[PDB]
Design a protein around this nucleic acid. Structure first.
Length: 101
RNA sequence: AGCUGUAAGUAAGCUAUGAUCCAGAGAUUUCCGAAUGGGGGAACCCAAUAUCUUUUAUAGGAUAUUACUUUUCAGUGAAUACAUAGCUGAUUAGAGGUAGACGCAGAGAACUGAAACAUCUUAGUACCUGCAGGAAGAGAAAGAAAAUUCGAUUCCCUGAGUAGCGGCGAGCGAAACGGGAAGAGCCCAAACCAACAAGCUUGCUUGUUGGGGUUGUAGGACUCCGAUAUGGUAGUCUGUUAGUAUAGUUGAAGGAUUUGGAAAAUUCCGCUAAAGAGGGUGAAAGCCCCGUAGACGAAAUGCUGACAACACCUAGGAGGAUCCUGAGUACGGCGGAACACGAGAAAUUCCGUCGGAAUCCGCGGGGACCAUCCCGCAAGGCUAAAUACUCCCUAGUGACCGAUAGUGAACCAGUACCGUGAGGGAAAGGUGAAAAGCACCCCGGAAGGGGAGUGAAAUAGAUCCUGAAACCGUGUGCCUACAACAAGUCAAAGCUCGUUAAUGAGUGAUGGCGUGCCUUUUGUAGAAUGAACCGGCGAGUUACGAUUGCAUGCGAGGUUAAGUCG
RNA sequence: GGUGUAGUGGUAGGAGAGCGUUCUAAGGGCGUUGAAGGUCGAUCGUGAGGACGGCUGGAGCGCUUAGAAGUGAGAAUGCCGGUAUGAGUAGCGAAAGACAGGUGAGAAUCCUGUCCACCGUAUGACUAAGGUUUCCUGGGGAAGGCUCGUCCGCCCAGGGUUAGUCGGGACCUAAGCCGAGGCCGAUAGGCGUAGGCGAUGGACAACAGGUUGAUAUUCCUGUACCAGUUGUUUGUUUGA
RNA sequence: CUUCUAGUGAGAAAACAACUGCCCGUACCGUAAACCGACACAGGUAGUCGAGGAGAGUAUCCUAAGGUGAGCGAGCGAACU
RNA sequence: GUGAAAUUUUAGUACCUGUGAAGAUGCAGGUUACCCGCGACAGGACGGAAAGACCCCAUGGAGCUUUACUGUAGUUUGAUA
């Protein structure tokens, strides 16, 4: 999906613009992604098997995948991603000076 | 790099030793149904014969085989002796469905038009039945014509609403010449000659296989010599490659600022294009995501070319003694039909019935019939393309619809529902960017509500976008219990307000005048006709011809049709 | 442009010139600092009609010039939908109940009792069609029930039907039906022989009692019967 | 079912014991609120059983075994039907 | 307690004598009459329900008759195979 489940990522659009975080889960075929600490939401649960005291709880919500950008692990600036011919495990070979991501 | 459909919810698991997913080839495939071992009220019931299994044994389980017809071969076989009916067995093919389409045949209406109706029209249309094919049908002159000819069939333009047909009425309605798309030709019978069998006429009569031979400028046989080579195919599940359909790969270029919950919007300053087609993203993006222009790719299976093999087919010149060239056929009388042609002066082509030729010194046609001239050679077979149609699969397109529209059906629709049955047949789309879908408290059995919270917004709370009218309520400024009112209009005191600012707005005691709307009628308030009310839908259009007015281009001239490239 | 003079009721019907709706092209524009749509106003033009302002609303839409049309609604005893009036009106589908006590948020209507009343060749018991889960147990009360409801043939969750001998098949045939060959006939097909299907009839071996919340000639107890199978108890000529 | 022969055709009669015996239906309503009548509808629905007194009787009235009080009520006690 | 229907242009819906498509709640001139209901009766609303079944028309249908026209199945008689 051009973004994987273990991955550091920066946010382009939507109220968390400029935040970073490690990807938490990938949902292909709906093209969304959960990022750590990024789209916090407040629910209201009644007691059930998990947390028999259901308070007002807060977890992340999935954002759309094109609101996101990969970060080169070694250098730290967000990059568009391209594919090139290494010994034939084709990996995302970063733009912005041809390094492996 | 995630995954176990819709589909939430939980429980158990799988995957970097490559899941899930995608394309080619395989394997498995209960029962009904042509249904085919026998039966039957479809999805059930009951067997026979062999091999194998459970049991000490019977009962029980499994696997194969077993319809009918045809067409080939053996065995058995008889009223009736020889053998043919028959019977048993082995072999060969059919059988049913559909694409509510397109084709060729058999049989074959009516309402309707003729301002009635019989001939005629509707119309050889609708319906029913047979046979197909990927196309069918037609197709290689017993032809079209009229001097000077041309050469198989089909389709389009034109000829032309002409020549004709017709209770000569309503109406029906050609063809050839001329211009184009596509183009292609072939095989038998007969005479004769051999091999075999029967009649052994031991005459050569019957036949079976092979050869020869295919036409009108007449051709062949037959006798004479030449040659014994050369031109082609509408052929094969044979090889060699080339492409192609069915998965995929890669693919340029942006940040800050203002307003917002959120920018793709605004303002600055950049970059990219063989890519500014389109879709998505919290609002409107060439530069965020999927793509696009361009470049690349197939283990397997199927298609289409090309070139190779293999299979088939194809010769001249002369002679004119004799033989061959499709018989109950052509044709004629009688009765019907088909030809645009309704018996007509009726040629041509078919069907039923009866009669019935000739043989190259011949036979047919040129719209009754004859003579002369001209063009052909029936009574045997096959054949690509140019033309018709779309159940279905891929890729797209639209001065086509947008939930009473568009399919009957945007949603679990040929469904619910209705009918014994054949058959008839609907209604019903939209929270939000994201479920963040209201934890906790209070009234109440609950339903429902009020706070508090989510959220940019809840009067976006699931009967959830917007939220019109009929219709039902609550509150108020002004009027109303001596008054006969198609309900308004003109005149007007009092009270209450204060506008798109101008000769202001609401209500109104009291006074004059005044019999709705539509349709059809000589004529309507009509006791003539229609409407409960509100909302939606609901009626002179298009194709091809003919005529007139206006307008433009050419002008004694004007203009192209089918078709070809695009 | 001025000025004079003359004219300007109208059904059938002829002629002219315009208003508004949707879509296409080209040009110039607007929009989350809020488009279309909805609602209100005391505004403009000779008419169809055009603006501007408030409130609502949340994503698209005007203007100019030309083009194309499923282009305008008050009426068809029109079609579909929604809602009125008649009106809190007719009716609530033959019949005897009363009281005490239970349950419950709530009782004329549900439960338990007592007395009273109704049918009794049926309004009692069993069965073939037909229906198809309506049967039993535990919960429920939004709709169905002509009132009510704590109740139910309603709704949710679980559960119930046991055969050598009963009724049907592995037995028989009636009417009628089907029919290998056959005979007839534009097609399709019509009839019919051998042989079959087809009960409402023929044939054919088990009874009495007990037991569940729901089955009993089916389960259990006792005592039987029918058809087979295994074991231990003479010449297929035929007198076996 | 019972006889008689024709008939491929070792030798089966009957004692005890113990074994074998398949498929379909089977709940519940059924003179009814469960079937046919659009309805929890004063209609229709084959067959067997169907008691007592008085009576010829399955008539008639009252009852036995069994079943039932019928799915809108409380008042008033006019016209009229 | 529950809860319909046929109907309906809008209605603040009197009487007499006239007028008028010639029999008026609504038009003229008069006469009478405070506002809103309940139980009853049927004179009027040419009352509701059914685009007259009576009568005539459409160069409308359909069923029937016959010495109306034109045909035909069936029966019969001749020629010919």
């Amino acid at each position: 999906m051009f973004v994987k489940k273990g991955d550091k990522v920066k946010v382009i659009t939507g109220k968390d613009k400029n935040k970073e975080g490690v990807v938490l889960a990938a949902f292909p075929k709906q093209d969304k992604v959960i990022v750590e600490g990024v789209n916090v939401v407040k629910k209201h649960q009644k007691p059930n098997q998990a947390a028999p005291q259901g308070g007002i709880l807060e977890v992340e919500a999935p954002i759309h995948v094109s609101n996101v950008m990969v970060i080169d692990p070694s250098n730290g600036e967000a990059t568009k991603v391209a594919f090139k011919e290494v010994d034939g495990k084709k990996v995302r070979v970063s733009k912005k000076t041809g390094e492996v991501l």
